[PDB]
C-alpha cells in the first residue's frame, strides 16, 4: 500500500510454471500512505511484477517474513551489515495469494559457479571480485 | 616514482628497473629540489592510507600539487608490505645524496621543513617530517 499504480501493461502478462499462476506487471510510482489514501479517495517510478496464485495457502511464509523483518530491524538498530530481503506476500482468499517477485533472478539451476565468478571478475587483483565476495559473505 | 607501486606485479618491477637506469645515468637528479618533495608526499599519503578502517570504501587517493592518483589493495598485510617496501628506497637515496653533496640537500630539507600547511597537521602523525628529521640526524 506504499505505492500507487500509474499504468497497467497489457502484453507483459505471462503464466508461471507451478496450477496456473500468472504474472501482472504495473508501471508504479512510490508516494506514501496518507497521500496514497487521499489520491485513492479522489481517483521513484518503477515496474512491479506480481505473481497471482490460486490453490494453496502461505501463512507459514507470513510467519517467516514477520521473523525476517524483526531480525532485520534488530541488526539495523545494533549497527551491523547483513542483508535480507523481506518481499511482500498477501493471502486474499482461501488458496488465493499475491506474491511480489524479485526482478533479475538468476537461480543456481540456470547456471561451476566459482568458474563463473573467476571469468566475470578476473583474478583477486580486481576490486569487483572482492566486493562480490564481501556481499556473498554478508 | 609515482608508478613504482602499481597494483600489478610486472609493472612495478619494470618501473624499478627503469628508475634505476635513469638515476644511474644522470647522477645530478639525486640532489634535485623537486624529486624529494614528491617522494615525501607519496610516503605521507601511503602512511595515511595504512590505518584507515579497512572496510571503508573508495580506496583511491590523491597527491597534492601533482595530477595523479593512488590505488591500494584490500588486506592489511599487503598494505604494510607495500609501505615497508617503499620506505627503503627513500632512505637509501637520501643517504647516497648526503654522501656526495651535503650542503645543498641539507638546505633543501630545511626549506621543506618550514611549509606552513604541514604545521597544523604536524600535531598528527605526518611521518614525512619524522623521516626527514631522523635522516638529517642519523
UniProtKB/Swiss-Prot annotation, chain A:
Interval of the full protein contained in this chain: 1780 to 1941 of 2102
The gene coding this protein: PI4KA
Subunit structure: Component of a phosphatidylinositol 4-kinase (PI4K) complex, composed of PI4KA, EFR3 (EFR3A or EFR3B), TTC7 (TTC7A or TTC7B) and HYCC (HYCC1 or HYCC2). Interacts with TMEM150A; regulating recruitment to the plasma membrane. Interacts with TTC7A.
Role, per record: Acts on phosphatidylinositol (PtdIns) in the first committed step in the production of the second messenger inositol-1,4,5,-trisphosphate.
Subcellular location as annotated: Cytoplasm; Cell membrane
Variant or mutagenesis effect after changing residue 122 to R: In NEDSPLB; uncertain significance
Organism name: Homo sapiens (Human)
Disorder named in the UniProt entry: Neurodevelopmental disorder with spasticity, hypomyelinating leukodystrophy, and brain abnormalities: A severe autosomal recessive disorder characterized by global developmental delay with impaired intellectual development and poor or absent speech, axial hypotonia, and peripheral spasticity and hyperreflexia. Brain imaging shows hypomyelination with decreased white matter volume, cerebral and cerebellar atrophy, and thin corpus callosum. Polymicrogyria may be observed in rare cases. Gastrointestinal defects and immunodeficiency syndrome 2: A severe autosomal recessive disorder characterized by multiple intestinal atresia apparent soon after birth. Affected infants have a distended abdomen, bowel obstruction and do not pass meconium. There is some evidence of inflammatory bowel disease. Death occurs in the first weeks of life. Some patients may also have immunodeficiency.
Name by which UniProt lists this protein: Phosphatidylinositol 4-kinase alpha
Tissue/organ expression: Expressed ubiquitously. Highest levels in placenta and brain. Little or no expression in lung, liver, pancreas, testis or leukocytes.
Similarity section: Belongs to the PI3/PI4-kinase family. Type III PI4K subfamily.
Highest taxon listed in the record's lineage: Eukaryota
UniProt region (G-loop), positions on chain: 33-39
Amino acid at each position: 500500500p506504499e505505492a500507487i499504480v500509474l499504468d497497467i501493461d497489457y502484453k507483459s502478462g505471462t503464466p508461471m510454471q507451478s496450477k496456473a499462476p500468472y504474472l501482472a506487471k504495473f508501471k508504479v510510482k512510490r508516494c506514501g500512505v496518507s497521500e496514497l489514501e487521499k489520491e485513492g479517495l479522489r481517483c521513484k517510478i518503477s515496474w512491479q511484477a506480481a505473481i497471482f496464485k490460486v490453490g494453496d495457502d502461505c501463512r507459514q511464509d507470513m510467519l517467516a517474513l514477520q521473523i525476517i523483518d524483526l531480525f532485520k530491524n534488530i541488526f539495523q538498530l545494533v549497527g551491523l551489515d547483513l542483508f535480507v530481503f523481506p518481499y511482500r506476500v498477501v493471502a486474499t482468499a482461501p488458496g488465493c495469494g499475491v506474491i511480489e517477485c524479485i526482478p533479475d533472478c538468476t537461480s543456481r539451476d540456470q547456471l561451476g559457479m566459482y568458474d563463473y565468478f573467476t571469468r566475470q571478475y578476473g583474478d583477486e587483483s580486481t576490486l569487483a571480485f572482492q566486493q562480490a565476495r564481501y556481499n556473498f559473505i554478508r | 616514482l609515482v608508478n613504482f607501486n602499481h597494483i600489478h606485479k610486472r609493472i612495478r618491477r619494470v618501473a624499478d628497473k627503469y628508475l634505476s637506469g635513469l638515476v644511474d645515468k644522470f647522477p645530478h637528479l639525486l640532489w634535485s629540489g623537486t624529486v624529494l618533495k614528491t617522494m615525501l608526499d607519496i610516503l605521507q599519503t601511503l602512511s595515511l592510507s595504512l590505518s584507515a578502517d579497512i572496510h571503508k570504501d573508495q580506496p583511491y587517493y590523491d597527491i597534492p600539487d601533482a595530477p595523479y592518483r593512488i590505488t591500494v589493495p584490500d588486506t592489511y598485510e599487503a598494505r604494510e608490505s607495500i609501505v615497508k617496501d617503499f620506505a627503503a628506497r627513500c632512505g637509501m637515496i637520501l643517504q647516497e645524496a648526503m654522501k656526495w653533496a651535503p650542503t645543498v640537500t641539507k638546505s633543501h630539507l630545511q626549506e621543506y621543513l618550514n611549509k606552513h600547511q604541514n604545521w597544523v597537521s604536524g600535531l598528527s602523525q605526518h611521518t614525512g617530517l619524522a623521516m626527514a628529521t631522523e635522516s638529517i640526524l642519523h
